[PDB]
Paper text:
In the human fungal pathogen [name], [name] encodes an essential multi-enzyme that catalyses consecutive steps in the shikimate pathway for biosynthesis of chorismate, a precursor to folate and the aromatic amino acids. In Fungi and Apicomplexa, the second to the sixth steps of the shikimate pathway are supported by five enzymatic domains combined in a single protein known as [name] or AroM. [name] forms a flexible dimer allowing relative autonomy of enzymatic function of the individual domains. Our activity and in cellulo data suggest that only four of [name]’s enzymatic domains are functional and essential for viability of [name], whereas the 3-dehydroquinate dehydratase ([name]) domain is inactive because of active site substitutions.
We performed local refinement on the dimer of the Aro1SK-[name]-[name] region, as well as the dimer of Aro1DHQS and Aro1EPSPS domains that resulted in molecular maps of resolutions of 3.16 Å for Aro1SK-[name]-[name] and 3.43 Å for Aro1DHQS-EPSPS. In this map, we performed only a rigid body fit of two high-resolution models for Aro1DHQS-EPSPS and Aro1SK-[name]-[name] domains. These two models (Aro1DHQS-EPSPS and Aro1SK-[name]-[name]) were obtained by docking and refining against cryo-EM maps X-ray crystallographic models described earlier. Within these particles, there was further structural heterogeneity, due to the Aro1SK-[name]-[name] fragment tilting in various conformations relative to the Aro1DHQS domain. There are additional contacts between the Aro1DHQase domains in the [name] dimer that may also contribute to dimerization. The Aro1DHQS domain, Aro1EPSPS subdomain II, and Aro1SK-[name]-[name] backbones show nearly identical conformation within the core structure of each region with minor differences seen in some loop regions.
Numbering used by the authors:
A (entry chain B): 857 to 865, 873 to 893, 913 to 966, 990 to 1550
B (entry chain A): 866 to 876, 882 to 898, 923 to 973, 1001 to 1559
The structure:
């Protein structure tokens, strides 16, 4: 988190704009003898904040190769962006670098979004930013059991619905080489963004990997560490020179420790299950997985008493077979699921059946959510959430209620027993904080609430419009923590949530342009001092506005461009059309009703800025509203089809 | 139990009661005052004393009836100026009403047998050891839902009458609503008078009408009287000392939901069930989370002396109703389900999705299997109960293709063996029932622990076809097996355990005739009839069975034997009409069905009734569930 990341092999400076780093290309810094005298200094003196991209043939000769491995063994990160001599130079990229990422090419823009969403999560892992935490409540983990994911490459977004992770059964591939499994991980990252469970399941535990190949099993699990998977999967019956070899150089990849009862005769009260749990605590495993086989329904209730007595480490525990479906329904962390377009052998339920049986035994209640506001017929929130409840087979409904005061929505909507949450689109955003007991940090500094879920001791309240603007920039190329400044054209509306969104993306000074300074200074006194709200009022400042790259137009686009507001906005886009530090400088407009607004035309072909429309704010604030209401991540391919078509 | 039954009432069920117990009968002012005394003490042990209708007209003559009550007698009323003198001088009542259909006649004379098995005290219904359910009839008046009450009680092994929510809680109304359930449902009645502190509409401040309501449950002969546990202790010790043979369920409910299933209040309520000697103890909580269900299965395994109906409530306690074994409350679409109880489809659908059941496959095996009508019977019962099973056919001639294609598979559920393979499947049953040894054929092979169980349900189809047409289960008549066909040995065995003192074989030809006596025990007395003069000594024959095929119209030596046997029919009067049962399915008009009905006035029964009742006990053996009878009868008769 402190040192540098040597990149060997357009993605290099995007990594620089994530941690606040700056690129140092060694091609411009400048045959094989002067390449060794350069590798001495900058690999040690520029060991603070530089993403030291190298040339092509740096690995020629033993001069820098023993220098790269000296820094790779001293805690440093040598990273390889695999593109696609290449049979002779790539074989020194693979033995020098300790971390590998496959930057495969993307045609559609949804694949190019996933590869920057899976490279934030990759860099958050190998650097030490955030280890992949165990999910809080109920989570799933889809068991991708296809021998070639390119046969099911189109429907991968429909497979990973409800899943918090994917379970890459490595032994079930065509060939378990070093190169085929590294190419299948690039498919669940250009078509998904979930963490990967790297299961190499031996033949003594129910898979297709031979037990005598210990050296080919050590190499496979050491490769998954290099590719930055989030959950490596050792077995508790593995030899000690392979449990200790993996757990001494995992770095940050969490270890699930597994032992399945494939014969199916140990009930869940033996000392055989206390030892294998205690082997997982002794090897410092983040999750212990213990799989049984049910011969009756008592072994599912025998498992509910085993998990009570053993809560030291997180435990996955379920009973395989047709008589162990209850233990798969009642299991919290990483319940394995399957799909109809995948091969299925262990009879795991789908997400439509895991959520139906959890409703038929009373885990989900038939809750009712509402959206409130005075012009509520022109809304697309019941279109968005109901198509998310249908995809996950949740027993929820989302309806409308026209309201003007917050006293009526207490009686007709909130005081019901089946009430599950609200969503607010009115000046009721200011007056529904009367009900919120616990407010987030977003709701107090903005002074608006568009989500009202019930919790213990009252009700929770959060503004997700700052997610609705920050997420819309991240899905259009912007790093989540860049180093540019901001802009907000116009005040009023969702402008108080635009200023809170831009600072949390890492903007230094936020420049506000609007036709009335009386409502411009109101945003100045109502916000903290780390935000640096500098109103622009003269045209000389709009030339010297520093590093403006993320504008958010909150202006009502029924009145066109005022002119007295416009001569700065034509000038703001002038001096920043060439700075592209990790991202092309982009713009967002926070209203939905016209499909293209006056400001968006004037900035996309006249000044070369990327425009994101208002419907991409309705999804991303409805994505985060889906997570607070239900607890699941919404299917993005269906909430984006329901809000548009 | 060997004592008399003094039948009181107005001016059929008296001598049918005599024919059931094997007990004799004696029909019974100043000349009546002397003669009514000695027939109560020297005709005490044995005669069901049918007394008159004006016997209660006297003052002292009502007292000699009440002398029989407190000593331990079974004085009994069969149902305006004397109803206040009939219903007080009887420690058990019973209600006979006018019935329209033969199915309506059937349920009255079937729910009388389990009534008279209860109030005499022979075989009480002992707390069903499988996985039972109970329909919660929540209707104010059961004549509204009366056309569908056979569809309401489907898959339920008991009926939960909630007496509080009747529109009238009077003694005449509850005895009318029990009258309209024994006409359509031959099920045990759980008599629940629920008070307002536990979720009911009966008040708590009127204790006197609550005690006198549970006493109507003892006297109308219901099976389970509910007593509450937060009740007055004079009521608990009155419906546990005067309960008779009606069992006691003790309930406590948490209407608030302030107790979890680790509090000592649930332990004290189980010990109130153990100390009051209740048969089943009942504990209904309320689930505010799904953990409250798994806190219940750790209570159920720490408290196992008396059986426990333990289940939470609310929409978060559906696991506690699904995982419950004894008497899960179920409801219907046509009933006012207010505590959101499951239906019979939703209880089995949820038990399958959590792994209680498995998708099994049952088969019927035999060589001419193209027209069997056995898969149509069972598939009409899996559909009504929503069990996840299928029934199919497998043409077989040898028994080894059954073992390697059907039996050894992990989805094997059972077999229903037909004619050319019944003898061969006996080698697979590691536990044969007593009927399988005596008959010599097995038509049911269900898997058990370490092998398979082999039963012959052909005798219980020949038997239950008679009991469904008015013949008592233990009457005193004699029988006749006409033929020596494929079902001939089950019909000999079914005739003895019906209670015939004598079975008379009469065959087409005498080749396969004397072998039946060397292959049957001497206790099952089989007198072979030889000549026509021997038809005159054949006495009390009113339970005949024909299994001669309907290819030959009856003539020769055989016709003259049967022609003088059915002539001694209705005049013997063993409490029923003389009955013949044709064993062949397809020839609906058998010539022997004509010559016993259109000439000698017997009640003849076609072979569609035997094919159903053979499959009804196979359905109980294959699934553990009582089959819906109208749905499986209206699957063969098409």
């Amino acid at each position: 988190s402190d040192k540098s990341i040597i990149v060997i092999g357009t993605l290099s400076e995007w990594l620089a704009s994530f941690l606040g780093f700056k690129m140092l290309d060694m091609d411009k810094y400048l045959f094989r003898q002067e390449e060794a005298i350069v590798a001495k200094e900058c690999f040690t003196k520029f060991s603070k904040g530089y993403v030291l991209s190298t040339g092509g043939g740096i690995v020629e000769g033993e001069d820098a190769r023993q220098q790269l491995k000296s820094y790779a063994d001293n805690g440093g990160i040598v990273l390889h962006l695999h593109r696609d001599v290449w049979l002779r130079r790539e074989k020194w990229y693979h033995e020098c670098s300790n971390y590998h990422f496959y930057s495969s090419h993307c045609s559609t823009e949804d694949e190019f979004n996933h590869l920057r969403r899976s490279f934030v999560n990759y860099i958050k892992l190998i650097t030490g930013a955030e280890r992949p935490v165990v999910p809080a409540g109920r989570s799933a983990a889809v068991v991708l059991t296809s021998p070639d994911l390119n046969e099911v490459v189109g429907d991968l977004e429909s497979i990973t619905i409800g899943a918090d992770a994917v379970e890459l059964r490595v032994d079930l591939f065509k060939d378990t080489s070093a190169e085929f499994v590294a190419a299948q991980i690039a498919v669940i990252r250009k078509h998904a963004d979930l963490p990967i469970i790297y299961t190499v399941r031996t033949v003594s535990q129910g898979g297709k990997f031979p037990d005598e190949n210990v050296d080919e099993l050590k190499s496979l699990l050491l490769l998954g560490i290099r590719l930055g998977v989030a959950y490596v999967d050792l077995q508790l019956t593995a030899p000690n020179e392979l449990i200790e070899e993996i757990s001494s150089k995992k770095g940050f990849t969490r270890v699930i420790g597994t032992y399945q009862d494939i014969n199916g005769e140990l009930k869940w009260n033996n000392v055989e299950w206390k030892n294998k749990y205690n082997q997982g605590v002794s090897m410092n495993a983040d999750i212990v997985r213990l799989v049984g086989k049910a011969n009756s329904i008592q072994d599912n209730l025998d498992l509910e008493n085993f998990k009570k007595q053993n809560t030291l480490k997180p435990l996955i525990a379920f009973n395989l077979g047709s008589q162990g479906k209850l233990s798969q329904v009642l299991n919290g962390t990483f319940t394995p699921i399957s799909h109809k377009l995948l091969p299925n052998d262990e009879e795991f339920l789908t997400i439509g059946e895991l959520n139906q049986t959890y409703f038929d035994i009373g885990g989900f209640t038939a809750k009712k959510f509402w959206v409130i506001g005075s012009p509520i017929e022109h809304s697309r929130s019941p279109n968005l959430h109901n198509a998310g409840y249908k995809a996950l087979n949740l027993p929820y409904q989302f309806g409308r209620f026209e309201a003007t005061d917050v006293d009526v929505v207490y009686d007709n909507l909130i005081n019901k027993p089946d009430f599950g949450g609200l969503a607010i689109t009115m000046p009721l955003k200011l007056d529904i904080m009367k009900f919120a007991t616990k407010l987030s940090d977003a709701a107090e500094t903005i002074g608006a609430v568009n989500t009202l879920i019930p919790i213990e001791g009252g009700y929770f309240g959060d503004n997700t419009d700052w997610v609705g603007i920050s997420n819309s920039f991240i899905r259009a190329g912007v790093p989540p923590k860049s180093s540019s400044n901001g802009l907000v054209v116009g005040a009023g509306g969702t402008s108080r949530a635009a200023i809170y969104a831009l600072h949390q993306m890492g903007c230094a000074k936020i420049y506000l342009v609007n036709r009335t300074a009386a409502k411009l200074e109101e945003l100045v006194k109502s916000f903290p001092k780390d935000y640096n709200l500098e109103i622009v009022e003269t045209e000389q400042q709009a030339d010297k506005a520093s590093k403006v790259s993320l504008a958010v137009s909150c202006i009502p686009a029924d009145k066109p461009l005022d002119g007295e507001v416009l001569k700065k906005i034509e000038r703001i886009l002038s001096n920043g059309s060439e700075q592209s530090a990790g991202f092309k400088p982009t713009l967002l407009e926070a209203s939905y009703k016209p499909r293209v607004t006056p400001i968006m035309k004037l900035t996309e072909e006249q000044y070369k800025w990327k425009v994101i429309p208002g419907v991409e704010m309705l999804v991303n604030q409805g994505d985060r509203q889906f997570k607070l209401h239900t607890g699941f991540t919404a299917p993005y391919e269906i909430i984006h089809r329901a809000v548009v078509e």
